[PDB]
Amino acid sequence: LLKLFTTMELMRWSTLVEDYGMELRKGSLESPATDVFGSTEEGEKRWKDLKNRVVEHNIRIMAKYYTRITMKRMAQLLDLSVDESEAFLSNLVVNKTIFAKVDRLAGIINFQRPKDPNNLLNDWSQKLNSLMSLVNKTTHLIAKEEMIHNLQ
Amino acid sequence: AVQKVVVHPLVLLSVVDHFNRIGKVGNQKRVVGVLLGSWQKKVLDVSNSFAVPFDEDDKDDSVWFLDHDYLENMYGMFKKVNARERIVGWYHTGPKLHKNDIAINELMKRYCPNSVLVIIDVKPKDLGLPTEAYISVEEVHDDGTPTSKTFEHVTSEIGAEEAEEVGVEHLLRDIKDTTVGTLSQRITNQVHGLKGLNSKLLDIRSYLEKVATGKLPINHQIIYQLQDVFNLLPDVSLQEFVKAFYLKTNDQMVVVYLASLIRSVVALHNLINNKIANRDAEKKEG
Amino acid sequence: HLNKPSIQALIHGLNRHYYSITINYRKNELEQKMLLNLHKKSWMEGLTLQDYSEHCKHNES
Amino acid sequence: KILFTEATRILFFNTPKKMTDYAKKRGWVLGPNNYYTTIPSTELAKQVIEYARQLEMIV
Amino acid sequence: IISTHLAKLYDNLLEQNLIRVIEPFSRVQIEHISSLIKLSKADVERKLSQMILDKKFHGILDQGEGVLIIFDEPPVDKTYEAALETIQNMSKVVDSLYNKAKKL
Amino acid sequence: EKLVSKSVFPEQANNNEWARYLYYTGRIKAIQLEYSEARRTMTNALRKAPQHTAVGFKQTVHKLLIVVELLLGEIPDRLQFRQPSLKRSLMPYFLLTQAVRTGNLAKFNQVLDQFGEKFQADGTYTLIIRLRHNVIKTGVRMISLSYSRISLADIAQKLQLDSPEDAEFIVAKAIRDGVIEASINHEKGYVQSKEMIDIYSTREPQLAFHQRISFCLDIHNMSVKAMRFPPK
Amino acid sequence: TRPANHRQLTFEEIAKSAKITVNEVELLVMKALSVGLVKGSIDEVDKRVHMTWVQPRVLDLQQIKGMKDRLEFWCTDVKSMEMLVEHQAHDILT
């Protein structure tokens, strides 16, 4: 569970609960159950807090790895209602943490300020003068192969 | 180790003088010397060098002499004159590496653990090859390949300190230079850049020809970097980058229009003053 | 006599105990071309655009 | 995309066969359901080089 | 003097709420924002229109589909503000040259 | 016209001669249905005409420019109808222009009846008749300038065309020329106008500003060539 | 298999080629990006993936010949246009 939260990639809520309900909510014979995810009122509160955390980790991972996500698709991906998902995303961005700008049909998870012409052109220029990795490529081309050039 | 080798324009002159001096009668076509310089765990600069009596035989390219005691004696002299410079590596012309380079490098490794070879090409100075620096490395050939030595290329620059830039400048000052880059020289620089890119592309294509016909063995990192370069090419389609038009038009206004108008108006005013001054002189002729 | 002697040298004995000898520099084509590499920019900077934001700011100023 | 019948009505081709024949007469064709960019960088590069010339090469 | 101040405070609070909301959205039905802010659709539409008109919040309001759009205006324009003015400046210069032309 | 096509006017010609040539070739292309280029040439002629003098020349060029612009569907600016030295002379052309803006056929006919002598005196009668039959085109240009999408029945009602099919034919003919940029939809009845793309980021400003370069660099070159230093 | 001419690939292509349901293509590209293989992005609304990937492979000598032909095209473009620029600027290059 911890490593799964450490790495990237989605976190399907249904699979997570179906794989960890018997452990986090109930008691295991080898390992006593947590007192923090029980049927107590704070147990349910922490359970819903985790449900938000899996949803917030989901959202952050999409913002790092998506551009435009349909609202229904995103809603089922984090296993929340459409309205509640939109409200949660709105809360997230309003706190000025996860940059995002939700449209009703686009709910974009980023696409930062559509790269203005200056930024986009600087990006293209950097990609071009990074193509000068070619010169290294060619000089090493003659170097590492010259000791084969005279061995043919 | 070292991520850059800085060669001052004195070891260049020392190498050229050594090459001419030997090649008066010394038709080995390739001479070997030792280059000293201030050492760093960072960018390494070289500031002086000397030439050792070296001999090489084209048979098997493994029988050779580098006078190591002569090396020691010259280094003693140079330390007495300037102890600040320590032995950094060895240079040799003849841009085609022979077989002894690593072997000779081993001999240089005892006088300098991080001995860097610096091929200083003398005759071919067409576009961009003042010098090429290599450093021996300890790896067999790759993850899963047999053993070898495999000199590694290091970025090399040409730079001078003060009281050496002045000598270069003074020997220069032909119709060359003009450090202020006017428009004509900038366009010339663009043409030179296109020429250099074309030359590098032709070198890569010649290598790919020698590989495709099987003359050369496949270098896997070479092909990997070729794929990387080919993927790195941008797209001038995709009408979001085409909105670069925007900034080009933006460029236009500040340049072109405004500047032209100003230049044209200034020229017109200069014509008014002349057309006035001329008629002033003519009326005075009265 | 293409070059004139300096006052500083003249007071320190020039043309009285020692004479100045004209100095000419023997620079062949090869050495000049080798020295040219000191500021020979590259084949690359002929093709690298200015930082476009920096270019716009310079234009504005 | 104008429909065939309206064209027949307002082209004064009273005979529909005549209208079809005239449609074949022109490249303007019937169609299936009877319903009749890049940055050049070459010429404008030449323009910019021309500006550079007119700046240089004296008067 | 307490009704006026409190009405001004209410309007200020409404504006602060409206900017602290819709910030997530880039194109949002006015019905949704009215529901979220618990105000009438016409009232919030009028307030949004006034706020846009006063330029106190960047955006546009598409009444045709009952939506509010948000964006920003690029500040790259400044060079033209110099450029344009310079043009008019040299207009004066040309005028002065005309006087010198009258000399000749 | 045949002489003009085979003869090249010298570029180093005098200002007055250039203005006269522009007016003459403009009259040519105006009576030869090339209205747009005629108007452009007439405006260029007015630019190069003398400012103080040449009252008659400017009067004639202004009359022809009014008629050509009206024929093109555009409306001449009221400013020219107000200068003293031009006012009364253009007075007959003023009462005419109003009618074209209103489309009042009776007013047009009355103006023609009361000013045919003056119109023929400057040889604008035939062009004025062509305008009398292009008033509808002017109205369609105005309608498409104001409206984006509009039903053809609305066109007919506004223009007093008494028929939707007649309005359809008229708007199709007008859009065939460069008068209007639209796209008729006979299936429904739209006269949908072309979407106005951002002229910036469209290489059009680059072309215009390139022309303006060519001009300014040319001006600088002639200025620096004509310095003409003296011998003594 | 798409040499940047059409870098946008629809989820249908991955679903059919990888014999997976279109719901799991998101997770597949998700994993691929996470592990560092590829550096694209996903446009779910239009069902496409932008691809700028840096994982090369062995090159199948016929493929090496094809890449050499591509390099021939590139170098001939550069040469033609260097010739163009030189011819146009001949006045100022001097």
Alpha carbon distance F157, F165 (integer Å): 12
Sole residue written with tokens 């679903």: G15
Give the span between the Cα atoms of B39 and B28, in whole angstroms. 31
Name the 3-class secondary structure at E50. Answer: helix
Which of B178, B182, B184 would best serve as a mutation to test chain D binding (most D beta carbons within 10 A)? B184
Residues 219-248 of B with CB under 8 A from C: 247
DSSP string, A78-102: TT--HHHHHHHHHHHHHTTSS---E
Residue F110 lies in a domain: yes
Residue F167 lies in a domain: no
CA distances from residue G18 to B56, F166, G10, G15 in whole angstroms, order as listed: 61, 61, 13, 6
Closest by CA to B131, choosing from B145, B115, B116, is: B116
Helix (H, G, I), strand (E, B) or coil at E28: strand
Name the residue facing F217 among D3, D10, D54 (closest C-beta). Answer: D54
CA B17 to chain centre: 19
Any domain includes F188: no
Residue F115 sits in the same domain as residue F204: no
Q: Which residues pair with E69 in a beta bridge?
A: E27, E60
Contact, F201 vs B249, CB < 8 A?
yes
Q: B83: closest CA among B42, B44, B48? A: B48
Other CB atoms within 10 A of residue F62 CB: 21
DSSP at E66:
T
Give SS3 for A12.
coil
The C-alpha atoms of residue C41 and residue A122 are separated, in whole angstroms, by: 22
Residue F193 phi, psi dihedral angles, 5° rounding: -85, 160
Of the candidates F200, F220, F227, which has its C-beta nearest B264's C-beta? F220
Measured between alpha carbons, how far is F37 from F34 in angstroms, rounded to an integer? 6
Residue with tokens 């005691």: B69
Burial of B69 (0-12, 13-18, 19+ CB in 10 A): exposed
Give the residue numbers in B contacting A (CB under 8 Å), as ranges. 61, 96-99, 132, 134, 148-153, 155, 200, 203-204, 207, 215-217, 219, 222, 225-226, 228-229, 232-234, 240-241, 243-244, 246-247
- Resolution value in angstroms: 3.1
Between CA A141 and CA A147, with CA A144 as vertex, the angle to 5 degrees is 120
Q: How many CB atoms lie under 10 A from the CB of residue B277?
A: 12
What CA–CA distance (Å, rounded) separates A87 from A75?
11
Q: What residues in G contact B201, CB-CB < 8 Å?
A: 71, 74-75, 78
After which residues is the backbone of chain B broken at C–N > 2.5 Å? none
Residues F144 and F197 in one domain: no
Distance from CA of B254 to the nearest CA of C (A): 7
Per the structure, the count of domains in chain F is: 2
- Domain extent at residue F209: 193-227
Interface test with D, best of G81, G84, G91, G93 (most D CBs within 10 A): G91
- D56/G92 Cβ within 8 A: yes
Look at the alpha carbons of A134, A140, A145, A146 in this order and tell me if their dihedral is positive or negative: positive
* Six token digits for residue A124: 């293209």
| Residue at a domain's end among F126, F152, F178 | F152
CA distances from E66 to B26, E35, E42 (A): 90, 13, 11
Give chain B as a 3 state SS string.
Answer: CCCCEEECCCHHHHHHHHHHHHHCCCCCCCCEEEEEECCCCCCEEECEEEECCEEECCCCCCCEEECHHHHHHHHHHHHHHCCCCEEEEEEECCCCCCCHHHHHHHHHHHHCCCCEEEECCCCCCCCCCCCEEEECCCCCCCCCCCCCCCCEEECEEECCCCCCHHHHHHHCCCCCCCCCCCHHHHHHHHHHHHHHHHHHHHHHHHHHHHHHCCCCCCCHHHHHHHHHHHHHCCCCCCCCCCCHHHHHHHHHHHHHHHHHHHHHHHHHHHHHHHHHHHHHHHHHHC
Do at least 3 CB pairs under 8 Å connect A with C? yes
Q: Which chain F residues contact residue B243 at CB under 8 A?
A: 201
| F22 Cα to chain B: minimum distance (Å) | 25
For the record, the structure tokens of B282 come out as: 């003519």
Q: How far is CA D24 from the centre of its chain?
A: 18
Please answer whether residues D7 and D36 qualify as being in contact, where contact means their C-beta atoms are separated by less than 8 angstroms: yes
Tell me which amino acid residue B190 is: Q
Question: Is B244–A117 a contact, with Cβ atoms under 8 angstroms apart?
Answer: yes
Q: Taking CB atoms and an 8 Å cutoff, what residues of chain D touch B239? A: 37
Question: Does B197 touch chain G if contact means CB atoms closer than 8 Å?
Answer: yes
Report d(CA F76, CA G71) in Å as an integer: 61
Cβ atoms B120, C35 nearer than 8 A: no
- Distances in whole angstroms, Cα of residue A70 to Cα of each of A111, F144, G22: 14, 39, 14
* Contacts for G71-78: CB closer than 8 Å, 24+ residues apart: G71/B201, G71/B204, G71/B205, G71/B208, G72/B205, G74/B201, G75/B198, G75/B201, G75/B202, G75/B205, G78/B194, G78/B197, G78/B198, G78/B201
Which residues have CB under 8 Å from F216's CB, separation 6+? Answer: B257, B260, B261, B263, B264
CB contact under 8 A, B198 and G79: yes
HSE-CB of B240 using CA atoms within 13 angstroms: 8
Is residue B8 within 8 Å of B157, Cβ to Cβ?
no
Nearest CB among B183, B237, B245 relative to D52 is that of: B183
Amino acid in the structure at residue F9: F
Taking a C-beta distance cutoff of 8 angstroms, is the pair B35, B88 a contact? yes
> Torsion angle, CA of E5/E8/E9/E12, rounded to 10 degrees?
-160
Dmax over Cα atoms in chain D, in whole Å? Answer: 72
Yes or no: say if B186 and D52 are a contact pair by the CB < 8 Å rule: no
Strands B32-37 and B64-66: unpaired
Place of tokens 């930082």: C51
Closest-CA residue to A64 (of A13, A106, A115, A98): A98
Sign of CA dihedral E55, E59, E60, E62: negative
CA distance G43 to A66: 7
Q: Is C49 at the interface with chain B, CB within 8 A?
A: no
Could you tell me the CA-to-CA distances from B235 to F118, F166, G91 in Å, in that order? 65, 50, 32
In F54-178, alpha helices (H): 55-71, 84-102, 105-121, 125-146, 152-159, 164-176
Fill in the DSSP letter of residue A34. P
Q: In the structure encoding, which two tokens stand for residue B243, read together?
A: 């909105």
F140: left (phi over 0), alpha (psi -120 to 50) or beta: alpha
- B213-247 burial, b at 16+ Cβ within 10 Å, e below that, comes to eeebeebbebbbbbbbbbbbeeeeeeeebbbbbbb
DSSP E95: H
Interface of G with B in 25-54 (CB under 8 A): 52-54
Chain F, 189-208: which have a CB under 8 Å from a chain B CB?
200-203, 205-206
Distance in angstroms (rounded) separating the CA atoms of residues E15 and E41: 15
Out of B194, B208, B227, name the one closest to residue G68 (CB). Answer: B208
Neighbours of G58 (CB within 10 A): 11
Q: Where do the structural domains in chain B lie, given as residue ranges?
A: 2-182, 223-282
* Torsion sign, CA atoms B108, B109, B111, B117: positive
Distance CA G61, CA G67 (A): 10
Question: Does the beta-carbon distance from G92 to D50 stay under 8 Å?
Answer: no
Whether residues F197 and F147 share a domain: the answer is no
d(CA F88, CA F61) in angstroms, rounded, equals 15
How many CB atoms lie under 10 A from the CB of residue A13?
Answer: 18
Chains D and F are touching, with contact defined as 3 or more CB–CB pairs separated by less than 8 Å: yes
Angle at alpha carbon of residue E54, lines to E48 and E60, rounded to 5°: 45
Q: Using what technique was this structure determined?
A: cryo-EM
Residues facing residue A68 across a β-bridge: G43
Count Cα atoms within 13 angstroms, Cβ side, for G27: 11
Tell me the residues of chain G between 28 and 47 that have a Cβ less than 8 Å away from chain A.
30-31, 33-34, 41-46
Nearest to G42 among A8, A67, A106 (CB): A67
Residue among F188, F108, F189, F195 at smallest CA distance from F155 = F189
- Output the DSSP codes for F8-66: PPPTT--HHHHHHHHHHHHHHHHHTT-HHHHHHHHHHHHHHS-SSS-HHHHHHHHHHHH
Strand partners, B87: B36
CA nearest neighbour of B122 among B148, B95, B140, B162: B95
Residue B69, CA distances (Å) to B52, B56, B133 in order: 9, 17, 25
Backbone angles phi, psi at F130, to 5 degrees: -55, -35
Q: Would you say F201 and D37 are in contact if contact means Cβ atoms under 8 Å apart?
A: no
Q: Are residues F123 and F49 in the same domain?
A: yes
Q: D39, B244: Cβ pair inside 8 Å?
A: yes
Cβ-Cβ contacts under 8 Å for F46 (sequence gap 6 or more): F19, F58, F61, F62, F65
The CA distance from B42 to B1, in Å, is: 8
Distance CA G24, CA G29 (A): 9
Nearest Cα residue to A140 out of B200, B140, B158: B200
Q: Which two tokens stand for residue D21?
A: 């024949």
Task: Tell me which residue of B252, B232, G41 sits closest to A124, measured CA to CA.
Answer: B232
d(CA C50, CA B142): 39
Structure tokens at B217: 């063995």
Q: What is the bridge-based pairing of β-strands E25-29 and E67-69? A: antiparallel
Task: Report how many Cβ contacts below 8 Å link chain B to chain F.
Answer: 66
Cα G5 vs. chain centroid, distance in angstroms? 7
Distance CA(G74)–CA(E13), nearest Å, equals 62
Tokens matching residue B285: 């002729």
Strand order in the sheet with B116-119: B48-51, B32-37, B86-92, B116-119, B132-135, B152-154
Sort strands B116-119 and B86-92 into parallel, antiparallel or unpaired. parallel
The answer to whether residues F128 and F136 touch, using CB atoms and an 8 Å cutoff, is: no
Residue F98, sorted as left (phi over 0), alpha (psi -120 to 50) or beta, turns out to be: alpha
User: Is F34 in the same domain as F137?
Assistant: yes
The residues facing B32 across adjacent strands are: B92
Q: Are F79 and F86 in contact (CB under 8 A)?
A: no
Sheet containing E25-29: order of strands: A102-103, E25-29, E67-69, E60-62
d(CA A129, CA A119): 15
Report the distance separating Cα F49 and Cα F85, nearest Å.
15
What is the torsional sign of CA B68, B71, B77, B82? negative
For F86, residues 6+ apart whose C-beta sits below 8 A from its C-beta are F55, F58, F59, F62, F80
Query: What DSSP character marks residue G9?
Result: E
Task: Identify whether residues F108 and F213 lie together within a single domain.
Answer: no
Going by beta carbons, is chain F in contact with chain G, meaning 3 or more pairs sit under 8 Å apart?
no
* Structure-token match 């323009």, residue found: D47
Locus of tokens 């003693």: B76
Q: Does A87 touch chain B (CB under 8 A)?
A: no
b/e map of F65-78 (b: 16 or more CB within 10 Å)?
A: bbbbbbbbbebbee
Q: In terms of DSSP bridges, do strands G41-43 and E67-69 run parallel, antiparallel, or are they unpaired?
A: unpaired
- Residue among F231, F227, E104, E99 at smallest CA distance from B280: E104
Neighbours of D56 (CB within 10 A): 16
Residues F199 and F147 in one domain: no
For chains C and E, count residue pairs whose Cβ atoms are closer than 8 Å. Answer: 6
Look at G93 and B231 and tell me if their CB atoms are within 8 Å.
no
Residues constituting chain C: 61
Query: Which of G30, G45, G50 minimises the CB distance to A69?
Result: G45
Q: At what angle do helices E78-103 and B259-285 cross, to 10 degrees?
A: 10
F208 and F99: one domain?
Answer: no
Q: What residues are paired with B45 via a beta bridge? A: B6
**Best to test chain C binding among A118, A127, A134 (most C CBs inside 10 Å):** A118
Give E90's contacts in chain B (Cβ within 8 Å): 261-262, 265
User: Which residues are within 8 A (CB) of F128 and not within 5 positions of it... i.e. 6 or more apart?
Assistant: F67, F96, F112, F119
Integer angstrom CA distances of residue F26 from F68, F80, F134: 10, 19, 19
Largest CA distance in chain F: 82
Q: Of the candidates B65, B113, B123, B53, which has an alpha carbon nearest to the alpha carbon of residue B87?
A: B113
Q: How many Å lie between the alpha carbon of C46 and the closest alpha carbon of chain A? A: 11
| CA–CA separation, F219 and E87 (whole Å) | 17
